[PDB]
Design a protein around this ligand. Sequence first.
Ligand SMILES: NC(=O)c1ccc[n+]([C@@H]2O[C@H](COP(=O)([O-])OP(=O)(O)OC[C@H]3O[C@@H](n4cnc5c(N)ncnc54)[C@H](O)[C@@H]3O)[C@@H](O)[C@H]2O)c1
Ligand SMILES: NC(=O)c1ccc[n+]([C@@H]2O[C@H](COP(=O)([O-])OP(=O)(O)OC[C@H]3O[C@@H](n4cnc5c(N)ncnc54)[C@H](O)[C@@H]3O)[C@@H](O)[C@H]2O)c1
Lengths: 291, 291
Amino acid sequence: KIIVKHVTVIGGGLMGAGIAQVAAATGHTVVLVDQTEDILAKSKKGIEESLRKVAKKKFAENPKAGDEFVEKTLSTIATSTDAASVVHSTDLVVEAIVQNLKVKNELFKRLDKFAAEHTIFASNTSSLQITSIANATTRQDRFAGLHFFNPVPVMKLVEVIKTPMTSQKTFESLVDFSKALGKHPVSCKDTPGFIVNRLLVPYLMEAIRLYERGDASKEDIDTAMKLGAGYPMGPFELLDYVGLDTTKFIVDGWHEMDAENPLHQPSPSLNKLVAENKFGKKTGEGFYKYK
Amino acid sequence: KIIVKHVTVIGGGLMGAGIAQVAAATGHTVVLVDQTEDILAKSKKGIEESLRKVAKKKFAENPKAGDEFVEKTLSTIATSTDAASVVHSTDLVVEAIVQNLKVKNELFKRLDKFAAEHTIFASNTSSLQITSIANATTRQDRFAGLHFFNPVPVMKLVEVIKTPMTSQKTFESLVDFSKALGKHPVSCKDTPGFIVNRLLVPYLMEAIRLYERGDASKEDIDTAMKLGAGYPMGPFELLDYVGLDTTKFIVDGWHEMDAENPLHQPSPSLNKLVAENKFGKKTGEGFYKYK
Ligand SMILES: NC(=O)c1ccc[n+]([C@@H]2O[C@H](COP(=O)([O-])OP(=O)(O)OC[C@H]3O[C@@H](n4cnc5c(N)ncnc54)[C@H](O)[C@@H]3O)[C@@H](O)[C@H]2O)c1
Ligand SMILES: NC(=O)c1ccc[n+]([C@@H]2O[C@H](COP(=O)([O-])OP(=O)(O)OC[C@H]3O[C@@H](n4cnc5c(N)ncnc54)[C@H](O)[C@@H]3O)[C@@H](O)[C@H]2O)c1
């Protein structure tokens, strides 16, 4: 049982950068990876900005401290464009790149040849079976899902996904790692949607359908779930918040592998909006318009 | 323009007593109806204790005002075992009794002939279509759903259901009444589950099925939805809170009405717990053990 000290995060987007940020802020030695240096420098700048925002709202009584915090955490975030150059000495690889099974497998297959014997491989994906990706390597015992939620620095939850091949040693390691990041880990098999998404998304789709049916208004559905269920965000504010494109993606997928399941029939409204580039808060408009 | 001032509540259970308490606590004259004097004496005793509980905090700095509040509210709640005798000149009849369609229709067909012409009829039912009960009277235009949530005096939401026969005058009357109770009304057509239950129960069942499939434990699933979706209670904690038998009854109804919808497929575990009289908190045990 080895303790994860060096993390190699692959993906400089919202998730990857967040994962990198939290790992470094909790003492882990990180190497963020992306295709260009501009992508990387820009991703790291976002980390700094986010971290400084944290600093002020924690070290407001001694900026001198907040500065050390931010530079210390930032310094342990090395960067590289070819992950193959650092996996030979890394303890864990957390992938958070484009949802393309082929590209992911090509990545992990090559990474398999460079990685150390102990090195563990994890994917933060939400629309692919960890198993499909793990079979690109001959490291299945050290392969598993490590699912975070945006905004990673804030969401306390982390789903540790166990394939039929994940060893018990790999599992305890990521569980331990999850606690080391200050997050709370849960267990789930390699089933579509895992826990959260499997229970959130189908619900988000139902709300949409109740609206399309004209049974009630969006504003009302949102009020109904917030007040009658105590949810932080109404379903339509949540859809716009997590992305309409992101949502449609996971659902088209589920629908694809089970065309007959009613829980995944596509929504004309969600499609139209998505075809119109109205992805929610990201694009300033989804089911609602924004500032 | 009908302004609801005199309200007749039929049913002194958890929902009934709660609806009467709030109505009376917000300046409306109330007549609570039930089958026997003891029932009534107990319902009114609970209302009095709930109010005291509040008044002992709310008026800590004003004991006198606190008593006046409790007495005035209490004395604005009359009791009776003869509904027909009360609705002679009432403005609103809110029904919250045993979930038997046959019994509700009889009660309403009868009340319909004694109530004043302007009296609006409403049902707080969760497992019946308002249209059905409405057609037991010849006052359908004055018949609607007025759905509250336990604990009534706390939950600020109220679903105002309008059938395709309900008048706008009626709808608006109940919307103003809702605000008068200090609640926040939302509109939904007469469709099974309306909004909250229609979007919450099937989710709760999906949580149960995920567990029945063995994909994840109840504990992790609840932790997952709380930390990952910010929900106040995990689906299992919530299931024990709302009543496994209550939950079950609704789902069955939907299953009977739609025997082929997979969202209403019975849950072996849910049926077992009910069969073993483990309904949740109101038993000390359901999916979990309490106190
Ligand atoms: N958006 C969410 O809240 C959320 C939650 C869970 C999971 N996910 C999934 O996690 C992934 C992370 O998404 P994101 O929002 O950060 O997106 P993003 O587009 O901002 O970041 C992805 C990054 O992957 C890089 N990349 C692509 N191919 C690469 C390769 N071969 N080598 C190195 N880098 C490569 C891209 O240049 C890009 O910067 C997505 O696939 C997404 O579906 C998203
Ligand atoms: N229990 C819940 O959490 C919950 C949540 C939502 C909706 N509901 C619905 O709300 C209504 C209220 O349920 P409750 O929890 O207070 O139940 P309850 O069984 O505690 O109360 C019902 C009351 O109705 C009385 N009653 C029955 N038939 C009657 C009749 N013909 N005339 C007069 N009184 C009669 C009973 O004596 C009893 O006091 C029901 O229709 C129920 O399906 C229940």
